[PDB]
Every structure is written in C-alpha cells, then in structure tokens.
Amino acid sequence: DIVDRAKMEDTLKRRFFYDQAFAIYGGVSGLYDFGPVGCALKNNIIQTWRQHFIQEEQILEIDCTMLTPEPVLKTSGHVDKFADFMVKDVKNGECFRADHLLKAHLQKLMSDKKCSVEKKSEMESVLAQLDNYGQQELADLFVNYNVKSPITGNDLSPPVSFNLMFKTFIGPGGNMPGYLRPETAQGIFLNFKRLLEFNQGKLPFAAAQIGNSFRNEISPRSGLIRVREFTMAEIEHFVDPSEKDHPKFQNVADLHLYLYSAKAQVSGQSARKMRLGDAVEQGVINNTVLGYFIGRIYLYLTKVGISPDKLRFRQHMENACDCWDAESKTSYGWIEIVGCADRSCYDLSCHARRFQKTLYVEEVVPNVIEPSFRLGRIMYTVFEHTFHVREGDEQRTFFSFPAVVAPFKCSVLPLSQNQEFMPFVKELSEALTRHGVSHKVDDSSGSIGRRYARTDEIGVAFGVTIDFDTVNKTPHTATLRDRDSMRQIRAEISELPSIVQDLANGNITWADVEARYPLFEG
Amino acid sequence: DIVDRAKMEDTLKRRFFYDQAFAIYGGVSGLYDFGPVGCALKNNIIQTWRQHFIQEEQILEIDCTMLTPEPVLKTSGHVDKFADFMVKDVKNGECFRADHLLKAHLQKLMSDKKCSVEKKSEMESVLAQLDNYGQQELADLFVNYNVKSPITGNDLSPPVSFNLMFKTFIGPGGNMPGYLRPETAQGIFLNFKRLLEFNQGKLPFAAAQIGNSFRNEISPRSGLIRVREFTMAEIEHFVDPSEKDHPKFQNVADLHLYLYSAKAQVSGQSARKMRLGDAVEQGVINNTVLGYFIGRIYLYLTKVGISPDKLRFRQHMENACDCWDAESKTSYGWIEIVGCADRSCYDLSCHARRFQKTLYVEEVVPNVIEPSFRLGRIMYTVFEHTFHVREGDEQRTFFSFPAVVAPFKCSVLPLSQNQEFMPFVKELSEALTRHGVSHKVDDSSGSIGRRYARTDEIGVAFGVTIDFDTVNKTPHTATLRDRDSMRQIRAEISELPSIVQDLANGNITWADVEARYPLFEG
Ligand SMILES: [Cl-]
Ligand SMILES: [Cl-]
C-alpha cells in the first residue's frame, strides 16, 4: 500500500525536518516548526519552483501583506474564502467539524451489519451530497442520524457556520477590524492595474506571489495536511478569451498523466492515464492554456520527487469554474496539493468594481488560470513517496530526494579529523562551491558506514570519502558514493566536483559514471 | 544634505518598486505592496544575506510560525516586546503616540522665542529622559507642558500603555487567545534544545530565521521606516562565556567604521571613525565575538549598496544588554536598520525555565549575540543612498544598485523587433543564464537612448545592444554599456557573457574592460 508512516514520522522528528510548534507548552494543533534540514528542503523546493515557473514564464512576482482590512475580504468571501459548519457539545464544549462527524458516523452505521442494504444506498446518496448541504438540512441530517460526540458523548448543537479567517484589529481602538489572508491570490487582483501598466497593457501576463496564508482550522489532526499556517505559491495567468491558445503547449502535449474528470466521477469510472495532447483533443481538458499549466505542474511535481504512479489530476463537478486539482496519494488518501482553476467570471470583477484596453477601444475582461501550490503538502508528499528502508535488521532509513531538492547534494567524509585531510577537504569544498554544488563536511564521530547512514537519513544525494590513500598516493583520488544504490567509484579528487555537478544536474547517470571511472568496495 | 526624496518616491511608485497596500480602498497605514522590480531587489538582498551569513557561518536556519499563543509571549513581554504610550482625544477620538507629541511639542516651544534660556535647558533635560519616563510622570509632563492635539485641537487624555501586538484567537471559541509574533528571535529560543541536539551538543552555534513580523503601530506616517508588517532576518549566536573569542575576527579587525559609543553620547562627542581591531583593543567594543558580527554586518550593508559615509554603529546606554545598532542616515535622519545585541542574561532563561552540558557535568548558560536585520529599512536605505539624477533638463533618473542586488544585472537591447536579431538574442540570453547573469530582453518601443533610460531607472547594472552590424559583419560584436558612466565598448557577442559575469562579480572593473576592448560612441 502506502508507507510505514510511523517510522517515517519518527525519522522526520528525530532528524528535525519539522516538529510540533510550541511543544514545550503542550503544542498547538495545525502549527509546525521546520528544522535546519526541513528549511533546506523547503528552500530548495521553493527555488526549484521559481525556476520552473517565474523564470520560465517571465512571471511578474509580487509581495503583498498578510494583514487585510474587513471591507476588502467582504468583496471576496467573509463566508466563502471559507466557513466550515461547526457542532458544539452542551458540556465538554468541545468543537467539531460537522462534515467530518457526519461522514465518519455514516461510515460507522454504513458498516455495522445487523443493518439494511437500502440504508447503505441511502447513506451513499447522502455522502455524495455532503459538501453541498445547506445549514438547516445539515442540522436535520444530524438529528435524523442521531449524531453524537464521537469521543463520548453528550448531545450536539445545530451546525453553525464558522469563518476560518483569523480576526484581528489593524490599529488603535477598533474601527479597522482586519483579517489574516486565507489565500495569496487576492493580493494579485487588487494590483491588476499596476501589473497591467508594468506589462505595458499587453495581454497574456502572469503574476505570482510566494508567501504564508492562514486558515483557522476547527480541529487539525492530520500532520502537515491540515494546518493553520502554511507557505503557498500562487500564479494568476491573465488571458484574452479570444486568444485561448498557449504557444508553448507543444512542449507538454506529449506527457502521459492520470486524469480524473468530473464525468468519470459521476459515472463511477476510474482515473485514466492519458496523453495530454489527446486530452485536449478529446475535450476532457477544455483548452491548451489550461493544458499547458497542468503539464507544467506535473513536470514540477515529479521533478521535486513525487511519484507519477501516485499522481492524478481531478476535475471537480458542480461542487462557475473549471478546476483541475493535482492530487497525490498518501497514507491519508488522495490529498489536494496543487489547485489549477480556469475561470471566466472571477474575483477581480467584484474587487475593483479591472479591464485591459486591447486596441480599437474594446475593454477586455480577461479569463484567469490560477495554479495554486500547497508547498507544505507538496513537501510532505515527497517524504512519503521518497522514504525507504534498507535491508539489515538494523532497519536503516533513507530519503531518496532528487538532487535538486535534497538538503544538500554532497557530503565530504574525511577519516577521523586529522591536520592531514584538511587541505584536501578545503580544496574539495571550495571547488564544489565553484560548480554550484551544496555540501557539508561531516565532522561526526563513528564508523565510515554509520556516518553515511546518517547522511542518507536526511536524503543527501552523494558522498565523497577522503582517506589516507587520497592524501598519500599520486593520482589523488577519493571515493564517490551513490545514495540510492550505495555503490561507489574511485575518481581523481579534482574531477569529482565536475561529475557530482553532472550527476545532480541530470546530465549523466550513475551508470555512465561507473562506465568511465573505476569501481570501489571498502 | 540627503536626497530629493520627492523625486525618488515618484520614481519608486511609477516603476512600482513598492506602493501603498489597498490603495484602491483608501489604503492602510504602515502596509505596502512590493512590485515585480521591488521583489527582485528584495529577493536579491535576502539571497545576498543568506550567502553572507548562513553559508559563511554555517548557521542553522529555522522556520517557525507567526501565530503564537498568549502564554508564550507572557514569558517574554506582553508589555515589552512593545507597548507605546498612547494619548486619545476627547472628541475626534484620534489616537497619538505620546513620545512623539511631547517631543514635537517640546521642540515647538523649545524654539519659539519670546521664551527663556532656562526653559531650553529644562526641556533638553526632559528630552534626554523621554524614552525612560514612566506612566504617571509622563501624564504630568503632558499637563505640565499643556500638550494638546497637534492638528487641532481638543484636550488630551492621560497616556495609557498600548500593546503593539496584533491580537487574535487561535481556534474555535476563545480559549486560546494568540498573538502575531512581533519578532523572529523568540521562535529560535523555544527550539534551543532541538538545535543544540542537531549541533550534537557542541557550543558555538548560530541559528537564523528569515520571515515576517508584525508591529501594530499607532500612526505610521514615514514610508517604509515605520511599518506594521515587515520581513526580518534574525541570527542567534550562542557562545560559552568562557570562550568569548571569534577565530575569524582577524578577517574583519582591519575595517574602518564609525562608532558612536554610549559614553560619546553622554558627553556630547561626535561619531568617531575607528579601526575595528583598535576598537576592541581600546575597550569601546567589549569582545571579538560581538566585534566580528559588527564587521560582518558592515560588510553586508556596504555590499548591498549602503554608503560607508552615512553608516554608523550606535551603542545604547542605560535605555541588561550591550547593544550596537547599525544606523544609516536618511532624509528621516538616523534610522536603526540592524540591531546587534550582546546579552548575558537573555530570554531563553525565562521561556524554558535551556543549557548545554559542556563535558565534566557543568551546565552552561550560553551568552547570545543576536544581529537582527530590518530588511525593508535596509532596502529603503539603498534607495536613498543609491538614487541619482542625470544632467539634462529632461532630468533623468537612475539607481546605482550594486550588480549583486539590482533587479537584474543585464539588459539586452535589439533594434526594433526583427526576425533577424532573434537567434543572436536567444544565444546571448541562453549563454548569459549559463554564466549565472540575470537579464531581461527589452521588447520596448522607443529610441535606443530612451530604452536605456528606462532600464537605468530601475537600476539595471549593464546593457548589451544588438544592432544590424552585429548580425551582418563577421566578428559578430555588440555594444556593452555601463549604467553609472553610460560609457560603452564593442566586444565579441560570444565573450560578452564572460565579461558581464566578471563585472557583476567584482572580478574586473569597467576600467579594466575599457583597457582590453574597443570603445564605442553611437
Ligand atoms: Cl501546504
Ligand atoms: Cl524593515
């Protein structure tokens, strides 16, 4: 199935990729701190994103505030940037997510069988409408299914709407009640005119922003999946409805990805692998502008370490907007990691009322494709998809991060610290920085095998061990180790920077290296 | 004196470096949005910082949340992370900063002269104690100087303490009242043990965090100086009080910087330029650990574009902690851009109660040096110190950003878009990326001189113009222009990437280039 997450989490906590925020205070749900190793990974993911989108598409980056006054979020959704129905408990006051309790409790009596078959079908009919039940309706369903507090046990209260925005006051007194932005896309809209003027009024242009957003979750209890603070990457691509073709679609048309259309969901079909070019041809994917980004998102996700076999794109379906969500399969099931919405009528129209004056005195209300990246979930998906366990009964752990994402690409290992290795270590380190390869000198105590096990544990792609022979014999050669296979070669210490650079940047494979340079074993 | 800021601000707004947040709503004070050009600059500043500190000192980066519960900030300062005295107005309710009104009003009657000389001395005696007057005391001073609302005009209310933290509720209901972090340093303290364990319990180690902090200012009205949301870079360097020597101090001991000690302030002396090595020797700067960071901060600030002649380091003085603040001179006067505090008794002690077990069963309470960077103010300081005006009565504008900080380093200018230049433009762009030089192809309409004026306006360091001769004559050569001097050369289009790389990275000077490659003029 998925992954031994109990092991993975232990390694993630022990090596301090990330951990519970304010742990020495009991901790806060939905809040996490990222350690040195987690930051390196996060920064690499974000940097890879900047190269994949901002640099590639000439996107106009923006940096807006997280503090937003009330009036601004009233023209978007003081209700629907999001409010979840919340049921309280008339003692023990504990709050719950309505959709969650009803669903879980339905699955309880849905599978408890002195029960009926006609009830199964009834509860299925209800589950297929959960997300779209209004308030009353839901309250009735709570009473009609006798839903009580899961962990015992008192009766429940009519599900009331609960806004997921963090309230605050921007200033002295209380005349400017503000909100912590629940999403980054809105800041871009408010800046459409300045962005348009910056692009000289021309019209295909993309605007992006990488920052934190806040969602006041009722009861987050699923690790990095449901969190209250998270880093998000947003793109707002603006197109003239007339020219709905992307000139660069042919670069992606040939990809094969799993598509899970709305119609495939209505009629209980399965996710279907499909050529992206065919997808647009067959009409399952509306246009090539939407198609291009879907393929670029696919390329980015697989590049960062997500498995293609556990990656799908789900179109939603009457639950306005043509959205395809990049979903990854984890131990929590299929989670939405990247949203990509095609939108005719959008949220700039509400805000500003902007338009672009395409020549001849015509005001154009541009269509908008907005790919939104859940960076933390993307990061967590990499953990699960990349985590492996080695053979021995000292069941050792390692992450198979792509070199472009791993905390650092190379680890130099000199034998027990001697004034002897230093000049060689220093030269390797300096030469390694000159080829743009990240590294950390291992000044750690233990066997040469135990030290590599530690670096494997955090996913370091490569390793160079410097021994006495390296210092004292005259082709000065050290050994290069591959993380995944654990296989080693013996190359000249002055060429190593070049071949590690060529391995990180997929210019050559390990097989290529083992074909040019001698093998090594202990 | 300083700078024609009225002009600078116009250019900063017109080119959209940054602008007022929510402008189309009346705007919010202390909140600003950074445009495409501003982001490029900001990202470059931050990246230069990561290289200058994190990479150079092997600092352990961390990523903590901005949401902090009440109890955590109660062990730091529910009063003194900061509360400013605020005076309200018994009609027109307008709120004011007490320290501000009193000072401004004192300077009013301090310089209004049917007045006395003995009053001058009295008001000076008061001004030299402003920051340290308690609440009553201050209320009396308000009455005793008959301080009324500046912009008319009703009587004022006793100055009450006003916490500058943004209040919020982390969760459903209201049992976990939280705060938006006013500073980044605290998150590092709470993670001292995990950071210590990550450093294997050894003890000199530095921990850093780059993120946003929030300060609910009463009435911000000084551009990017006093803001409510800002990006901050924090370093927490932990040292054993026994080994208070930095092995790398000799790399900085030879710098010459202006030092403004506490004793020089008490006895109205002037800021004094001084060799950093001498400074530690003469005892003005306590130790070399503090000294090293002061010099590293100086190096960073000048590297990013701040003028050495308008940069000083001010030690404060009974207003616990040995702090030196990097201050820059602007049109607003001397502003604190980087704080650097040497602290014996710190804020981990309050939080956790951590310690490091230096061998032999001794628990060490480590001293902490914490350089904190106000990135936005640093950025603004660069604007003022770097902004210039060219000669002609079409008074043209340009920013002299260092190449390492400028939005992008190079601008390629082909003559009016022709299928002719494209292959040369494409090759230059691709070759330019291969040498790690940022660039943007100018697809703009206008004269070849007007187009460069536009790129100069945003501070682009270099420019390469491709003309017909470049395409049709057989040493294919284009012209390279220097931003500052406007001088040009004519080099082979395939060598240009190398020499632009060598100019950006201060490997060679423009004079060197003009000594190897032919000159050009129109
Ligand atoms: Cl996320
Ligand atoms: Cl700042």
PDB file of C-alpha atoms in Angstrom, chain A residues 65-67 169-173 176, chain B residues 27-32 95 162 164-166 180-182 212-221 223-231 374 377:
ATOM      1  CA  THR A  65       0.778  41.982   3.090  1.00  0.00           C
ATOM      2  CA  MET A  66      -0.983  39.312   5.144  1.00  0.00           C
ATOM      3  CA  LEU A  67      -2.953  41.959   7.024  1.00  0.00           C
ATOM      4  CA  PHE A 169      -7.604  44.787  14.681  1.00  0.00           C
ATOM      5  CA  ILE A 170      -5.320  46.838  12.436  1.00  0.00           C
ATOM      6  CA  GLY A 171      -4.616  49.939  14.526  1.00  0.00           C
ATOM      7  CA  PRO A 172      -5.527  51.567  17.845  1.00  0.00           C
ATOM      8  CA  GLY A 173      -9.091  51.189  19.135  1.00  0.00           C
ATOM      9  CA  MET A 176     -10.425  48.809  11.359  1.00  0.00           C
TER      10      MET A 176
ATOM     11  CA  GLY B  27      -5.019  52.482   1.730  1.00  0.00           C
ATOM     12  CA  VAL B  28      -3.799  51.241   5.098  1.00  0.00           C
ATOM     13  CA  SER B  29      -1.029  53.000   7.025  1.00  0.00           C
ATOM     14  CA  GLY B  30       2.172  51.030   7.615  1.00  0.00           C
ATOM     15  CA  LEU B  31       1.340  48.479   4.927  1.00  0.00           C
ATOM     16  CA  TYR B  32       2.957  48.326   1.491  1.00  0.00           C
ATOM     17  CA  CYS B  95      -5.039  58.379  18.756  1.00  0.00           C
ATOM     18  CA  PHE B 162      -0.797  50.313  24.245  1.00  0.00           C
ATOM     19  CA  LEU B 164       1.833  46.802  19.733  1.00  0.00           C
ATOM     20  CA  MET B 165       0.933  43.141  19.226  1.00  0.00           C
ATOM     21  CA  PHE B 166      -1.844  42.051  16.880  1.00  0.00           C
ATOM     22  CA  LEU B 180       1.166  37.708  15.784  1.00  0.00           C
ATOM     23  CA  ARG B 181       4.897  37.493  16.500  1.00  0.00           C
ATOM     24  CA  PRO B 182       6.424  40.978  16.868  1.00  0.00           C
ATOM     25  CA  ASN B 212       7.713  38.458   8.621  1.00  0.00           C
ATOM     26  CA  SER B 213       6.978  40.148  11.941  1.00  0.00           C
ATOM     27  CA  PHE B 214       4.094  42.388  12.983  1.00  0.00           C
ATOM     28  CA  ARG B 215       4.003  45.613  14.995  1.00  0.00           C
ATOM     29  CA  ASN B 216       0.654  47.365  15.447  1.00  0.00           C
ATOM     30  CA  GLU B 217       1.916  50.940  15.068  1.00  0.00           C
ATOM     31  CA  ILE B 218      -0.281  53.737  16.429  1.00  0.00           C
ATOM     32  CA  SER B 219       0.065  56.085  13.453  1.00  0.00           C
ATOM     33  CA  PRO B 220       2.774  55.146  10.914  1.00  0.00           C
ATOM     34  CA  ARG B 221       3.481  58.037   8.548  1.00  0.00           C
ATOM     35  CA  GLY B 223       7.062  55.371   4.455  1.00  0.00           C
ATOM     36  CA  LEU B 224       8.909  52.072   4.840  1.00  0.00           C
ATOM     37  CA  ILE B 225      10.569  53.195   8.087  1.00  0.00           C
ATOM     38  CA  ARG B 226       7.651  52.665  10.465  1.00  0.00           C
ATOM     39  CA  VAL B 227       5.600  49.747   9.148  1.00  0.00           C
ATOM     40  CA  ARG B 228       3.136  47.234  10.601  1.00  0.00           C
ATOM     41  CA  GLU B 229       4.339  44.258   8.566  1.00  0.00           C
ATOM     42  CA  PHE B 230       7.958  43.702   7.567  1.00  0.00           C
ATOM     43  CA  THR B 231      10.413  40.965   6.625  1.00  0.00           C
ATOM     44  CA  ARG B 374      15.324  45.253   9.262  1.00  0.00           C
ATOM     45  CA  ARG B 377      14.556  49.662   6.017  1.00  0.00           C
TER      46      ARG B 377
END
